[PDB]
Enzyme design. Structure first.
Site, mmCIF file in Angstrom:
data_model
loop_
_atom_site.group_PDB
_atom_site.id
_atom_site.type_symbol
_atom_site.label_atom_id
_atom_site.label_comp_id
_atom_site.label_asym_id
_atom_site.label_seq_id
_atom_site.Cartn_x
_atom_site.Cartn_y
_atom_site.Cartn_z
ATOM 1 C CE1 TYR A 77 -2.436 -3.418 1.872
ATOM 2 C CE2 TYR A 77 -4.032 -2.117 0.642
ATOM 3 C CZ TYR A 77 -3.672 -3.299 1.266
ATOM 4 O OH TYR A 77 -4.548 -4.361 1.283
ATOM 5 C CB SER A 78 0.846 4.318 -2.134
ATOM 6 O OG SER A 78 0.273 3.534 -3.164
ATOM 7 C CB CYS A 254 -0.357 6.847 -8.102
ATOM 8 S SG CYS A 254 -0.261 5.603 -6.812
ATOM 9 C CD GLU A 294 4.647 2.345 -6.954
ATOM 10 O OE1 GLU A 294 5.855 2.441 -7.286
ATOM 11 O OE2 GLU A 294 4.258 2.431 -5.766
ATOM 12 C CE1 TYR A 296 -4.094 0.658 -6.252
ATOM 13 C CE2 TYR A 296 -1.954 1.721 -6.521
ATOM 14 C CZ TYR A 296 -3.257 1.738 -6.043
ATOM 15 O OH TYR A 296 -3.714 2.839 -5.355
HETATM 16 C C1 LIG Z 1 2.489 -0.646 -5.232
HETATM 17 C C2 LIG Z 1 1.036 -0.892 -4.805
HETATM 18 C C3 LIG Z 1 0.379 0.103 -4.082
HETATM 19 C C4 LIG Z 1 -0.940 -0.094 -3.682
HETATM 20 N N1 LIG Z 1 -1.614 0.902 -2.960
HETATM 21 C C5 LIG Z 1 -2.944 0.712 -2.562
HETATM 22 C C6 LIG Z 1 -3.595 1.702 -1.847
HETATM 23 O O1 LIG Z 1 -2.966 2.728 -1.589
HETATM 24 N N2 LIG Z 1 -4.937 1.520 -1.434
HETATM 25 C C7 LIG Z 1 -5.617 0.329 -1.755
HETATM 26 O O2 LIG Z 1 -6.787 0.128 -1.417
HETATM 27 N N3 LIG Z 1 -4.938 -0.658 -2.479
HETATM 28 C C8 LIG Z 1 -3.610 -0.462 -2.881
HETATM 29 N N4 LIG Z 1 -2.931 -1.458 -3.594
HETATM 30 C C9 LIG Z 1 -3.613 -2.725 -3.890
HETATM 31 C C10 LIG Z 1 -3.692 -3.556 -2.622
HETATM 32 O O3 LIG Z 1 -2.542 -4.420 -2.558
HETATM 33 C C11 LIG Z 1 -5.019 -4.318 -2.625
HETATM 34 O O4 LIG Z 1 -5.751 -4.026 -1.425
HETATM 35 C C12 LIG Z 1 -4.760 -5.812 -2.790
HETATM 36 O O5 LIG Z 1 -4.068 -6.015 -4.029
HETATM 37 C C13 LIG Z 1 -6.045 -6.632 -2.788
HETATM 38 O O6 LIG Z 1 -6.670 -6.564 -1.515
HETATM 39 P P1 LIG Z 1 -7.048 -7.887 -0.729
HETATM 40 O O7 LIG Z 1 -5.837 -8.577 -0.249
HETATM 41 O O8 LIG Z 1 -8.064 -7.421 0.224
HETATM 42 O O9 LIG Z 1 -7.751 -8.796 -1.875
HETATM 43 P P2 LIG Z 1 -7.254 -10.286 -2.248
HETATM 44 O O10 LIG Z 1 -7.881 -11.211 -1.290
HETATM 45 O O11 LIG Z 1 -5.787 -10.297 -2.438
HETATM 46 O O12 LIG Z 1 -7.941 -10.586 -3.666
HETATM 47 C C14 LIG Z 1 -7.547 -9.892 -4.853
HETATM 48 C C15 LIG Z 1 -7.812 -10.748 -6.088
HETATM 49 O O13 LIG Z 1 -9.233 -10.809 -6.326
HETATM 50 C C16 LIG Z 1 -9.444 -10.897 -7.753
HETATM 51 N N5 LIG Z 1 -10.438 -9.842 -8.013
HETATM 52 C C17 LIG Z 1 -10.368 -8.568 -7.602
HETATM 53 N N6 LIG Z 1 -11.449 -7.904 -8.011
HETATM 54 C C18 LIG Z 1 -12.211 -8.761 -8.678
HETATM 55 C C19 LIG Z 1 -13.430 -8.645 -9.325
HETATM 56 N N7 LIG Z 1 -14.065 -7.477 -9.340
HETATM 57 N N8 LIG Z 1 -13.955 -9.727 -9.928
HETATM 58 C C20 LIG Z 1 -13.320 -10.897 -9.914
HETATM 59 N N9 LIG Z 1 -12.150 -11.039 -9.302
HETATM 60 C C21 LIG Z 1 -11.574 -9.992 -8.681
HETATM 61 C C22 LIG Z 1 -8.117 -10.547 -8.441
HETATM 62 O O14 LIG Z 1 -7.542 -11.727 -9.007
HETATM 63 C C23 LIG Z 1 -7.230 -10.044 -7.305
HETATM 64 O O15 LIG Z 1 -5.886 -10.487 -7.497
HETATM 65 C C24 LIG Z 1 -1.601 -1.279 -3.999
HETATM 66 C C25 LIG Z 1 -0.944 -2.277 -4.714
HETATM 67 C C26 LIG Z 1 0.369 -2.087 -5.128
HETATM 68 C C27 LIG Z 1 1.051 -3.214 -5.929
#
Ligand SMILES: Cc1cc2nc3c(=O)[nH]c(=O)nc-3n(C[C@H](O)[C@H](O)[C@H](O)COP(=O)(O)OP(=O)(O)OC[C@H]3O[C@@H](n4cnc5c(N)ncnc54)[C@H](O)[C@@H]3O)c2cc1C
Length: 296
Positions: A77-78, A254, A294, A296
């Site tokens: 998370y940023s 971003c 950046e 995601y």
């Molecule tokens: C560099 C970077 C910075 C980030 N900054 C932020 C931030 O500032 N704020 C923020 O909220 N997040 C941010 N994220 C994303 C953050 O990591 C997400 O919260 C995370 O990727 C997914 O959250 P989770 O673990 O709750 O979901 P998970 O349990 O990991 O599930 C996610 C998976 O669900 C599947 N999926 C997602 N949506 C759907 C859909 N609509 N339909 C079907 N399948 C789906 C996808 O395959 C996805 O990989 C950032 C990511 C990166 C790489």
């Protein structure tokens, strides 16, 4: 040799398997009840041990056994707060978290693991923090640079981090006297993130800060088109283009992975009018540390 603030950067002090255990201080839903999906602003204690700077990220290790019987992998998370943090004691980190809730084409309501752990965090509870991570989204060393910032949704975070250090704080070796420009694209007004703080900045430094919002469901342009981040950018096309030809101009992007597309669509129009191929030119900008992405 670099053009960004990487003087003594700290990367990866805490590892996934031995992370810093912090505690939740505050945690607040910063979006209206009628918004598409809730976003939370949360403040963590670090007792000064996580030496991050503006535009870095932290990984969070969510509590729980996974659907196989082993600890969850981290989620990045940023960092939504400045170096010195929301309280200014340099002992806090902050996050801008969208609660991932979707319904799959099997019918079930699926909650994303980490985001729900984060948006359900209570003051006092423990959070596992890793990193910090990142070098791409660092502030430009030059305090008189033109800092264009383009974000959608939670992608605002590093820009909030940027701007807090620019206008909300006084620093000895940093006195921002450039032009900072924010474009923030959201769907609804209720989906606006940190509007209040940004508004305050604008009237505090009218010469140095410019603020355009783009609310796609509620706003429209002269052609009656929905206002996305690029639709709003288009309105200053010739001006934005002109700044990009300058060597002290730093663009940061971003948010949602999809956002990168529309912007390019707008940039082709621009560069073509000056006889340049945008995709070709972007590469020059990237290697010159001026186009920074950046998503995601
Ligand atoms: C560099 C970077 C910075 C980030 N900054 C932020 C931030 O500032 N704020 C923020 O909220 N997040 C941010 N994220 C994303 C953050 O990591 C997400 O919260 C995370 O990727 C997914 O959250 P989770 O673990 O709750 O979901 P998970 O349990 O990991 O599930 C996610 C998976 O669900 C599947 N999926 C997602 N949506 C759907 C859909 N609509 N339909 C079907 N399948 C789906 C996808 O395959 C996805 O990989 C950032 C990511 C990166 C790489």
């Amino acid at each position: 040799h670099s053009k960004k603030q990487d003087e003594n950067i700290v990367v990866n002090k805490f590892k996934p398997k031995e992370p810093y255990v912090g505690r939740c201080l505050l945690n607040t839903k910063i979006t209206g009840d009628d918004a598409p999906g809730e976003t939370w602003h949360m403040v963590f204690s670090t007792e000064g041990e996580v030496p991050y700077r503006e535009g870095q990220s932290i990984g969070i290790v969510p509590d729980g056994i996974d659907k196989n019987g082993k600890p969850h992998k981290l989620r990045l998370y940023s960092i939504a707060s400045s170096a010195i943090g929301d309280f200014g004691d340099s002992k806090t980190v902050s996050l801008c978290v969208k609660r991932l809730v979707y319904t799959n084409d099997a019918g079930e309501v699926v909650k994303g693991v980490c985001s729900n752990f984060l948006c359900d965090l209570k003051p006092g509870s423990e959070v596992k923090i890793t990193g910090p991570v990142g070098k791409e989204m660092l502030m430009p060393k030059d305090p008189n640079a033109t800092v264009i910032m383009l974000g959608t949704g939670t992608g605002i975070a590093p820009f909030r981090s940027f701007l807090w250090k620019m206008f909300f704080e006084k620093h000895e070796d940093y006195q921002f006297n450039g032009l900072a420009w924010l474009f923030l694209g959201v769907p609804t007004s209720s989906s606006l993130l940190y509007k209040e703080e940004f508004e305050k900045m604008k009237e505090k430094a009218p010469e140095n800060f410019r603020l355009d919002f783009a609310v796609s469901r509620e706003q429209v342009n002269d052609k009656g088109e929905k206002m996305y981040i690029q639709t709003r950018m288009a309105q200053y096309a010739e001006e934005l283009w002109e700044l990009l030809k300058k060597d002290n101009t730093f663009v940061y992007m971003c948010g949602v992975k999809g956002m990168e597309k529309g912007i390019d669509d707008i940039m082709v129009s621009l560069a073509a009018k000056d006889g340049i191929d945008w995709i070709e030119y972007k590469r020059t900008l990237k290697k010159a540390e001026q186009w920074n992405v950046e998503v995601y």
